[PDB]
Design a protein around this ligand. Structure first.
Ligand SMILES: c1ccc(Cn2ccnc2)cc1
Ligand SMILES: [Zn+2]
Length: 323
């Protein structure tokens, strides 16, 4: 009876040296991400809307143009909602579908529903158009390295639909895409043909990005079982800082500080966490001041902060995958 699902417990990163860190810093482009990955998502895109369809097409197209062997899947399903039955579609992009283990990066691509107010429309820039764009920029910036995966471990990206409540958050009105996909993955044998392991056993770590893009974010170290990975993010931020590779950044104002959060923040990681998947929840506390406000827009985003986090996240992923 294989112990492969325990490999994640002993997995260590292959740390990048200074030269490699400089290479990663120079290899990502915040202006290219802004124009090509982010702006097309700064639209109304609540579930079932024309915008949801356009956002999904954009995400798929941006992944499809890459060289790495991404396998795209649209996970479409029905769920009861305050407005009756509706259809939702999660987007899953996977390198090496049959590899037993995957490091998983995720965010939600839907925007919260709000009727138009005084000619303004809610586009959820930090929530979570920026996280979406960061994942797309990561796939682009690391494309050559990821192409080499074509340690039975690879990478998967999940863009959840329906993270937001249609009304105000409640247990049955929220997390539509993640509740559905976690249940589906928990009941799907993995690798193909397995007798007693599921796709969830194959999820090494779920790194969920949410509410990123405002100035001065502070991310708490939420869970003991992923604390060592939170410490790696701290170390990466520190070294990139010391090498002069971050912009408008100080250690006093670092993003990954030494502090935990004992409370529970409901988000897409919940259905996975309650089924035993280790989670690194990259959501800041406190939330952006513009949270769930029409001001959660492009003008209020902090460019250098997002650029800095792109560098940190890309190093984290390469070190995790030994690339
Ligand atoms: C309360 C309840 C649930 C959440 C989750 N959340 C995250 C992004 N938009 C909403 C936040 C506050
Ligand atoms: Zn939200």
């Amino acid at each position: 009876a294989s112990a492969w699902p325990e490999e994640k417990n002993y997995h260590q990163p292959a740390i990048l040296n200074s030269s490699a860190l400089r290479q990663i810093a120079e290899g990502t482009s915040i202006s290219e991400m802004w124009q090509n990955d982010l702006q097309p998502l700064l639209i109304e895109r609540y579930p079932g809307s024309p915008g949801s369809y356009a956002a999904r097409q954009h995400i798929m197209q941006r992944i499809q143009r890459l060289q790495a062997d991404w396998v795209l899947e649209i996970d479409t399903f029905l769920s009861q909602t305050p407005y009756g039955y509706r259809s939702f579609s999660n987007i899953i992009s996977t390198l090496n579908p049959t590899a037993k283990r995957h490091l998983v990066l995720a965010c939600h691509y839907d925007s919260k529903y709000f009727s138009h107010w005084n000619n303004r429309v809610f586009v959820g820039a930090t929530d979570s158009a920026v996280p979406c764009a960061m994942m797309l920029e990561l796939a682009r910036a690391l494309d050559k390295k990821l192409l080499s995966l074509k340690p039975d471990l690879s990478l998967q990206l999940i863009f959840f639909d329906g993270e937001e409540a249609f009304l105000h958050w409640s247990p049955q009105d929220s997390l539509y895409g993640s509740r559905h996909l976690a249940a589906k993955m928990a009941s799907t044998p993995h690798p193909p043909g397995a007798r007693g392991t599921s796709q969830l056993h194959g999820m090494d770590l779920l790194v969920l990005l949410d509410l990123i893009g405002a100035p001065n974010p502070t991310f708490p170290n939420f869970f003991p079982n992923s604390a060592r990975w939170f410490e790696r993010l701290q170390a990466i931020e520190h070294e990139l800082h010391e090498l002069g590779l971050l912009k408008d950044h100080s250690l006093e104002g670092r993003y990954f500080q030494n502090y935990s959060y004992g409370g529970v923040i409901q988000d897409d990681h919940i259905p996975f966490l309650r089924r035993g998947v280790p989670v690194l929840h990259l959501i800041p506390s406190p939330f952006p001041e513009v949270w769930h406000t029409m001001d959660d827009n492009e003008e209020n985003l902090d460019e250098s902060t997002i650029d800095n986090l792109n560098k940190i996240l890309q190093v984290f992923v390469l070190e995790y995958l030994h690339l």
